[PDB]
Automatic annotation (TrEMBL), chain A:
Protein name: Uncharacterized protein
Organism field: Trypanosoma brucei brucei (strain 927/4 GUTat10.1)
UniProtKB/TrEMBL annotation, chain G:
GO BP of this protein: mRNA stabilization
GO molecular function: RNA binding
Domain of life: Eukaryota
Source organism: Trypanosoma brucei brucei (strain 927/4 GUTat10.1)
Residue ranges, annotated region (Disordered): 178-205
Protein name in UniProt: Mitochondrial ribosomal protein S18
From TrEMBL, chain H:
UniProt-recorded name of the protein: Uncharacterized protein
Source taxon at top rank: Eukaryota
A GO term from the CC aspect: cytoplasm
TrEMBL record, chain K:
Residues of the full protein shown: 50 to 243 of 1211
UniProt-recorded name of the protein: Enoyl-CoA hydratase/isomerase domain-containing protein
Length: 184, 49, 73, 196, 71, 140, 266, 159, 153, 241, 174
């Protein structure tokens, strides 16, 4: 029978089944395409893919799509799950702020420590310890140091991990990325 | 309303650019008003018997 | 039915202050000493003539954060 | 005197009438319990019932905060390891141990960095216990039923719009294409419940 | 709002205003102004149950100042 | 010994406790101290006594003529608080009073939000902190 | 009693009173250590950042001009408020003034049915990045819910301290040992120190204190990756067993065993 | 405006486009209404392919903007006239033009309480801004403000 | 406001329909969506296409002949201020060439690394404990079921 | 360095410092340094930025308008605060199709669809004609009567399938091109558009088996078409709801 | 009261038409986003309170300094005179104004009335901008302050400020 595109049985391969829509070039997906990336010359498409997937996963879009596209759930269970999600979020936010309000104190104590180092060894000395080019006679030394800093600052492409999808038996959640039990 | 429909497409150097067709005219206008302001103020400083 | 662990020993968050407030001890000790049968402790011998401030009220009884309750703090 | 006012000789000192009928509550709060450990309901650390609480739900994610041992965990050196990996993959005729030296330098520092972060985090656990945690004494805020009153306020509103009638009522879900499959004279979109 | 409910009086909620404002330890209460209400206020202020009161000739309400002693 | 803790609170835990050299406020503090020792009063009760004690008419509005944010200087407080423990017979060896009152403050100086305290854990109450985490305690 | 922000029982601060730095450091102060002291100056009155959302739900976002273009005919300005898929952000992620939300969902609707915006996807996604506050990991915004960034800067500054310490331990080391190139027999170190300390020890110059050292280094070239041929035993065809593998004894004292661990589909 | 339309049309030979627009226009005049502006745009490439009366999906379409003053009774007739025409792929209708979203919310209007005549006088272009609009019009606007306010009475009190 | 009367209708329609006629000496006005649309000659066949769309137009109907349509140019100041505009655009393309991605040097050397670390993550994953329910068959499920039902004996 | 320096012989230099010129100078100096510093200890990053800007800059009366004038200009107050660039604005920041794919009559569209228990790949001519059939994780063996369903839709299966498909895809492509007279004899790549569906494990591996073919296939555009359900017909009912 | 929708309690000290806060059909409160400055989300907002604390300030008298000329020349703005103070001011409450009940609570959804928050759009000031100066210049309004001549607001102020209400409630001895 007619299935939607995100349906389980959507694109079937069988003797009866035949795919629907213009399937190439200007296609069925014409204005329905969620992402587009022009591949930068000499860039493997694996970085492209892992960037896309990290994006979708971190913003909880792949969560949503997996969730809704597998089973039906009544508007009550959907509400319960979404608002539960959002309230757990709220709680953990109010935890993060506490942690952060402490870590800014820790960072302060560190900077203070740095001040005490300053008036033990004198300011200029401390600056020397931190990579100040006081030994730079001419610009060529400067350009060596700054060439070093350039070769550091240039960012090698980050390969960001995407948690695998866990296929369980009757699939209570197809959002399952871990083996922990969940409240449905 | 006939202001907002007055934009236009020109090619500057090698690149495409959207400009107002009337922009320079408004610049002349605003400049003239500024010069009249200057006249007015300089004239308030003029000798007052 | 799951509940936060220590709810058994949970303090009364409105009234747990009352017990400790200076006026209460002033009154109680006041009618204890009045009996004639109790030797007054010395703090009473002192604050007898310098009773504590009037209008300092907790935030528990008055639910106003903006009320500046204490002349001191 | 020699110890706490909330704890007498035989256990927690039983103030409310619940303690006198149920005096198991005085001497046993769990399997992390000791006798000095009464009245301090949280037990030691790394110990059973040592976890601090935040608005009643316990804090079991601490390491995940400072980014030690988490999936989202903070990584110190990336550029190095990538650089070195590139070196290994390119060719075998030239071998660069220069990269492996920059990297092992990086690591050598990383160790002390991590011990520092851990120490600072334990100080955070201490501070959080002193000045924030309620010691599991307040009602959970983190699940929707705890907020029922809030939702009630919304249901009430949708009722007063309906002439103060249908509480908790919602529009009948129609069909995937109810609007275009129905003939003239039948409702093609879901109405307010009172409107039925 | 309905039949079975009591029929309230300016005196009824005058008393309950004052009671609740006394429980929350407030200095001032805005309270309904009718003949017997501000009568009640003058009598209470006679006996010294109330620090003070005033009618501003505001139609709806007038104000009472509460007195606390020993906390 | 809990006495030193109490005195630490009166010294460091109170914004603007008037001029603590003046014989009036000084006597307040003296009496309350002798009442925390010899168990005649709870620490909480004696603290709330101290901060609610009678000082001077229009106190805040005289405080606007000295303080900006209402935080006075802490020297008078510590000098008075040591003085009281010396004049009362609190310790067998005279120095110990001053030393402990000083030391306990210096250790707390390094702590995050050092001079504020949660009102429940600040003093004696049903539920307490473990002896390591108690505030001006010797075990921190 | 709860603070509003995270529910703290105190009001956050670092220092309060004018005297505390003095009184804490008093012996140093009479001594005169504290004269040029920049630690007692810089951080003396230093207080915490304000970590607060001035807009918990932004009535500020967007600034006024933007509203003009929130209509159906500005695909770009629609796009700066969506995800890269075109969906809206949940309220507690990207908060918007309710006007903006109305105008935006209406816009995307209209634009879609007129064919001026795609049914999925954000066509302006890259162009719009200027308008979004992209936050560099190098700057620090005192207000973030990011717990990573905070600890990153903590790391950074602490390591900046460690650098100093290490610099000045290797310096004084270099001068204690370089004194020997300055004075061979010069003395300047005690005779008893000549007896006891001139011998190799774990503090002086140990050989190596740890297992798995590096011995036998050579210049030989790298080999081909995966020189090894797969073993005859197939690891692929074997199924991994965890829970039932060994036999266990339950420490359960009383009551029914928890239904969530076992007896409950994941 | 009182009403506006965006009409996505099939890109035909010019005589046909002109006939169709004459049909819509005459359909507006017969029904006792006015045309503030009939604006033409080019043949564009939309984000969604439209099918025409031939059920042949189209990659390109001609866009046409209508701005009308009608009664709300007889624009039902014009509506089902326009939507039922074979050369119109799609038509979206804006009725919000007299009270648009950005006004009359908690006394935002200074010196007046909902003056309706502010947005009626205006055309759609200045109520809803097009993307090309930049800070440059902030200039032009005021030269068209000040200038206007100078010549208005003198022009009006002439006759 | 210029209201189109019934008399002026077809004249005004034609004035607006000839707006883009595919040649002029003057710069063209944009859309309400702010695009430069296709230039049709008389009778509305599409003669000239703007450079953003040329690829797809040509790919869909190759037989169709159309020209890339360039705006009429206008120069501010001299060719000097224009060369300075050129320096500005090349400098912005330089800061963006810096910021965009470094990508090492050679492609295959990078791809090898990415795939390696994906593999290592795959086999550090395979060592995680699963849940009891995932691991066991229906056999022992039924075993524990009967074992539970009969428990009262 | 133990070269005796007498404090009396310096006197001339000290007298130079009593002159109000040099003290005017120390005043200017100290008043320029008295603005509040946000620098604190020496920073490598900021030094680098500073000197990089120095390399970039080394490579490098009219009546004041009063408050009344800006009182009368309503526009100006809105220009000062505006986000909108004033001047000629770049067109590439307007046009809809600026950031979007640009296709060619010769392109091959590779579909990698990852499903939960399955993965498959297909390829299509730009004109929509199917090249080779759909090679599927159950079509290639690789699935049933085996290890389990848990691993059925896994990464390595997707890899097996895609890498098996491309191998068979090249020759048929050269034949379909030989039919119209496009030889593509040597030193050519197929320009490929990889369209990926599904957010399932079998996706990762799939694209990897494309990347190792980079000497044969050249990927211009990577765009994923993944259906999103706003709402629609009911999905099959699961266990709980 | 443990019943949901009855949580707002019994407050008499409100200005509403019921002493039972939870039967009041006017202002539905918001438990999640409310009560930063007022303590609990049940209690009345700072500007609507009909009962006042000892050490807390009471309401500002609205103006809508010139009239202090007789006073201390340095005396700045009196703390209780405010330009904008509205006793009738609608505070945004989600369950009323943004109501997600009839939806699945997805990101854009819920019905919104915009009549609450003042419009931050630029549409308003553009659409109404006129060469004729505003209401104040035109002096369209009759009346003025509703109490007529007021020493603080309209007329000048002489003598001394009573900041506590001490002279304002006293009993005539005569
Ligand atoms: Mg059938
Ligand atoms: Mg149960
Ligand atoms: Mg229990
Ligand atoms: Mg337990
Ligand atoms: Mg059932």
């Amino acid at each position: 029978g007619g299935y939607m595109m995100y349906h389980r049985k959507a694109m079937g391969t069988m003797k009866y089944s035949k795919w629907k829509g213009a399937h190439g070039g200007i296609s069925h997906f014409y204005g329905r395409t969620p992402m587009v990336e022009e591949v930068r010359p000499n860039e493997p498409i694996t970085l492209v893919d892992r960037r896309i997937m990290h994006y979708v996963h971190h913003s909880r879009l792949r969560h949503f799509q997996l969730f809704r596209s597998y089973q039906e759930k009544s508007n009550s269970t959907e509400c319960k799950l979404r608002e539960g999600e959002m309230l757990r979020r709220r709680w953990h936010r109010r935890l993060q702020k506490s942690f952060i309000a402490f870590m800014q104190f820790k960072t302060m104590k560190v900077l203070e420590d740095q001040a005490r180092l300053v008036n033990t060894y004198g300011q200029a000395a401390v600056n020397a310890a931190l990579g100040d080019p006081w030994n730079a006679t001419d610009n060529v030394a400067r350009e060596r140091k700054s060439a070093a800093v350039r070769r550091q600052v240039r960012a090698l492409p980050m390969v960001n991990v995407v948690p695998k999808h866990v296929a369980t038996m009757k699939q209570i959640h197809n959002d399952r990325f871990n083996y922990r039990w969940r409240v449905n | 309303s006939e202001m907002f429909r007055a934009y236009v497409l020109e090619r500057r150097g090698a690149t495409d650019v959207v400009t107002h067709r009337d922009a320079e005219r408004a610049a002349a206008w605003s400049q003239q008003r500024q010069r009249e302001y200057d006249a007015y103020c300089s004239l308030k400083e003029a000798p007052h018997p | 039915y799951k509940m936060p662990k220590n709810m058994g020993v949970a303090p009364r968050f409105d009234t747990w202050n009352e017990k400790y407030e200076p006026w209460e001890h002033m009154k109680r000790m006041g009618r204890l000493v009045g009996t004639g049968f109790y030797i007054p402790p010395e703090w009473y011998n002192h604050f007898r003539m310098f009773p504590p401030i009037n209008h300092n009220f907790q935030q528990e009884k008055t639910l106003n954060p903006h009320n500046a309750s204490e002349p001191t703090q | 005197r020699q110890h706490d006012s909330g704890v007498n000789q035989y256990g927690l000192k039983p103030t409310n009438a619940y303690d006198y009928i149920n005096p198991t509550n005085l001497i046993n709060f769990g399997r992390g319990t000791t006798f000095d450990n009464l009245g301090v309901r949280r037990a030691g650390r790394g110990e059973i019932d040592s976890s601090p609480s935040h608005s009643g739900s316990p804090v079991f994610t601490q390491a995940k905060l400072i980014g030690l041992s988490g999936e989202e965990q903070l990584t110190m050196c990336q550029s190095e390891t990538m650089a070195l990996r590139l070196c290994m993959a390119k060719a075998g005729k030239e071998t660069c141990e220069r990269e492996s030296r920059a990297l092992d330098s990086c690591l050598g520092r990383v160790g002390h960095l991590r011990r520092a972060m851990s120490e600072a985090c334990w100080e955070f656990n201490d501070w959080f216990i002193q000045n924030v945690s309620d010691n599991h004494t307040k009602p959970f805020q983190h699940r929707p039923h705890d907020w029922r009153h809030f939702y009630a306020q919304e249901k009430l509103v949708r009722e007063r719009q309906q002439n103060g009638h249908a509480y908790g009522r919602r529009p009948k879900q129609f069909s995937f294409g109810a609007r275009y499959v129905k003939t003239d004279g039948y409702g093609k979109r879901p109405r307010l419940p009172y409107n039925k | 709002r309905r039949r079975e409910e009591n029929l309230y009086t300016p005196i009824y909620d005058f008393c309950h205003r004052i009671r609740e404002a006394t429980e929350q330890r407030k200095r001032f209460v805005v309270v309904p102004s009718t003949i017997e209400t501000r009568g009640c206020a003058r009598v209470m202020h006679d006996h010294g149950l109330v620090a003070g009161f005033r009618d501003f000739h505001n139609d709806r309400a007038f104000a009472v100042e509460l007195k606390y002693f020993q906390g | 010994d809990d006495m030193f803790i109490w005195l630490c609170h009166t010294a460091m835990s109170v914004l603007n406790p008037g001029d603590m050299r003046s014989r009036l406020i000084y006597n307040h503090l003296r009496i309350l101290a002798e009442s925390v020792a010899s168990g005649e009063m709870t620490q909480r009760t004696a603290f709330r006594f101290f901060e609610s004690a009678v000082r001077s008419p229009a106190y805040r509005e005289i405080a606007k003529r000295q303080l900006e944010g209402g935080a006075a200087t802490r020297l008078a407080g510590i000098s008075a608080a040591a003085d009281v423990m010396r004049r009362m017979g609190l310790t067998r060896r005279p120095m110990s009073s001053y030393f402990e009152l000083y030391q306990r403050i210096v250790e707390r100086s390094e702590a995050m939000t050092p001079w504020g305290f949660p009102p429940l854990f600040q003093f004696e109450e049903r539920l307490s902190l473990e002896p390591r985490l108690k505030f001006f305690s010797r075990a921190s | 009693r709860e603070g509003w922000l995270f529910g703290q029982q105190v009001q956050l601060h670092y220092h309060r009173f004018p005297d505390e730095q003095l009184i804490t450091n008093l012996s140093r102060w009479r001594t005169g250590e504290t004269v040029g002291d920049i630690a007692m100056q810089q951080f003396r009155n230093a207080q915490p950042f304000d970590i607060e959302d001035k807009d918990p739900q932004g009535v500020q976002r967007p600034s006024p001009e933007v509203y003009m273009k929130l209509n159906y005919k500005n695909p770009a300005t629609i796009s700066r408020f969506l995800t890269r898929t075109g969906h809206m952000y949940p309220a507690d992620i990207l908060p918007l003034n309710p006007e903006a939300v109305v105008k935006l969902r209406v816009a995307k609707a209209q634009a879609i049915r007129i064919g001026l915006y795609p049914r999925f996807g954000n066509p302006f996604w890259f162009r719009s990045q200027k308008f979004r506050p992209k936050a560099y990991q190098e700057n620090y915004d005192p207000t973030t819910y990011s717990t990573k960034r905070t600890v990153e800067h903590f790391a950074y500054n602490w390591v900046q301290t460690d650098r100093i310490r290490r610099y000045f331990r290797e310096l004084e080391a270099v001068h204690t040992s370089g004194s020997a190139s300055a004075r061979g027999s010069g003395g300047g170190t005690t005779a008893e120190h000549k007896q006891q300390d001139q011998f190799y020890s774990p503090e002086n110059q140990p050989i190596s204190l740890h297992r798995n050292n590096i011995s036998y280094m050579e210049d030989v070239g790298r080999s081909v990756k995966n020189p090894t041929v797969p073993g005859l035993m197939s690891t692929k065809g074997m199924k991994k067993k965890f829970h039932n593998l060994y036999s266990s004894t339950s420490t359960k004292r009383m009551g029914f065993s928890n239904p969530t661990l076992g007896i409950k589909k994941v | 405006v009182f009403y506006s339309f965006v009409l996505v049309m099939k890109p035909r030979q010019r005589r046909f486009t002109s006939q169709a627009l004459r049909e819509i226009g005459v359909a507006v005049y017969s029904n006792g209404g006015l045309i503030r502006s009939i604006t033409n745009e080019g043949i564009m490439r939309p984000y969604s392919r439209f099918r025409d009366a031939d059920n042949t999906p189209l990659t390109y379409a001609r866009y046409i903007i209508l701005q009308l003053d009608m009664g709300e009774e007889e624009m039902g007739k014009v509506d089902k006239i326009i939507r039922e025409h074979q050369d119109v792929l799609m038509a979206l209708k804006l009725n919000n033009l007299e009270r648009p979203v950005g006004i009359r919310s908690g006394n935002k209007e200074l010196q007046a309480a909902y003056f309706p005549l502010d947005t009626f006088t205006r055309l759609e272009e200045e109520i809803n801004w097009s993307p090309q609009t930049s800070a440059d019009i902030y200039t032009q606007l005021e030269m068209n403000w000040k200038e206007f306010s100078r010549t208005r009475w003198s022009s009006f009190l002439r006759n | 406001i210029n209201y189109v009367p019934h008399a002026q209708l077809r004249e005004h329609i034609d004035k607006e329909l000839d707006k883009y006629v595919a040649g002029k000496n003057e710069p063209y006005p944009l859309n309400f969506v702010g695009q430069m649309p296709f230039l049709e000659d008389g009778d509305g066949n599409i003669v000239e296409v703007p450079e953003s769309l040329l690829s797809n137009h040509m790919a869909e109907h190759p037989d169709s002949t159309a020209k890339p349509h360039e705006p009429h140019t206008s120069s501010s100041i001299s060719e000097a201020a224009a060369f300075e505009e050129r320096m500005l655009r090349a400098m912005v393309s330089a800061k963006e060439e810096d910021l965009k991605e470094w990508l090492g040097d050679d492609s295959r050397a990078l791809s090898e690394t990415i795939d390696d670390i994906s593999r290592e993550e795959e086999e550090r994953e395979a060592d995680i404990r699963v849940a009891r329910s995932m691991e066991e068959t229906d056999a022992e499920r039924e075993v524990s079921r009967r074992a539970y039902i009969e428990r009262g004996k | 360095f133990i070269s005796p320096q007498l404090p009396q012989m310096d006197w001339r230099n000290m007298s130079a410092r009593s002159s109000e010129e040099s003290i005017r100078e120390e005043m200017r100096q100290l008043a320029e340094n008295d603005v509040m510093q946000h620098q604190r200890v020496f920073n490598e990053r900021m030094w680098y930025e500073k000197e990089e800007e120095h390399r970039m800059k080394a490579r490098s009366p009219p009546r004041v308008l009063g408050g009344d004038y800006f009182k009368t200009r309503f526009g100006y107050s809105l220009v000062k605060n505006s986000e909108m660039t004033q001047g000629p604005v770049d067109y590439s920041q307007l046009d809809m199709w600026g950031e979007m794919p640009r296709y060619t009559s010769d392109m091959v569209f590779l579909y990698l669809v990852s499903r939960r228990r399955n993965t498959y790949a297909v390829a299509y001519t730009y004109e929509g004609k199917r090249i080779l059939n759909t090679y599927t994780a159950g079509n290639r063996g690789l699935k049933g009567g085996d290890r389990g369903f848990r691993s059925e839709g896994s990464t390595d299966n997707g890899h097996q399938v895609t890498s098996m498909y491309l191998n068979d895809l090249l020759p048929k492509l050269r034949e379909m091109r030989a039919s119209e007279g496009r030889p593509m004899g040597r030193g050519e790549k197929v320009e490929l558009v990889v369209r990926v569906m599904g957010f399932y494990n079998g996706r990762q591996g799939a694209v990897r088996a494309v990347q190792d073919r980079a000497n044969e296939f050249h990927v211009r555009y990577f765009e994923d078409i993944t259906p999103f359900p706003l709402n629609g017909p009911k999905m099959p009912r699961g266990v709980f709801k | 009261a443990n019943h949901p929708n009855r949580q707002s309690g019994i407050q008499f000290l409100t200005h509403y038409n019921t002493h039972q806060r939870f039967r009041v059909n006017k202002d539905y409160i918001d438990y999640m986003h409310w009560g930063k400055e007022q303590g609990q989300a049940r209690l009345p907002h700072r500007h609507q309170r009909v009962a006042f604390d000892f050490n807390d300030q009471l309401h500002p008298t609205r103006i809508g300094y010139a009239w202090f000329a007789s006073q201390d020349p340095t005396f700045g703005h009196h703390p209780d005179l405010s330009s904008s103070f509205d006793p009738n001011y609608r505070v945004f409450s989600h369950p009323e104004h943004w109501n997600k009940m009839f939806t699945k609570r997805r990101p854009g959804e819920g019905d919104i009335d915009l009549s609450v928050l003042p419009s931050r759009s630029l549409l308003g000031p553009l659409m109404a901008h006129s060469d004729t100066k505003g209401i104040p210049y035109f002096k369209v309004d009759n009346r003025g302050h509703s109490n007529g001549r007021v020493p603080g607001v309209n007329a000048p102020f002489f003598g001394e400020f009573d900041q506590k209400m001490m002279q304002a409630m006293s009993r005539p001895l005569n």
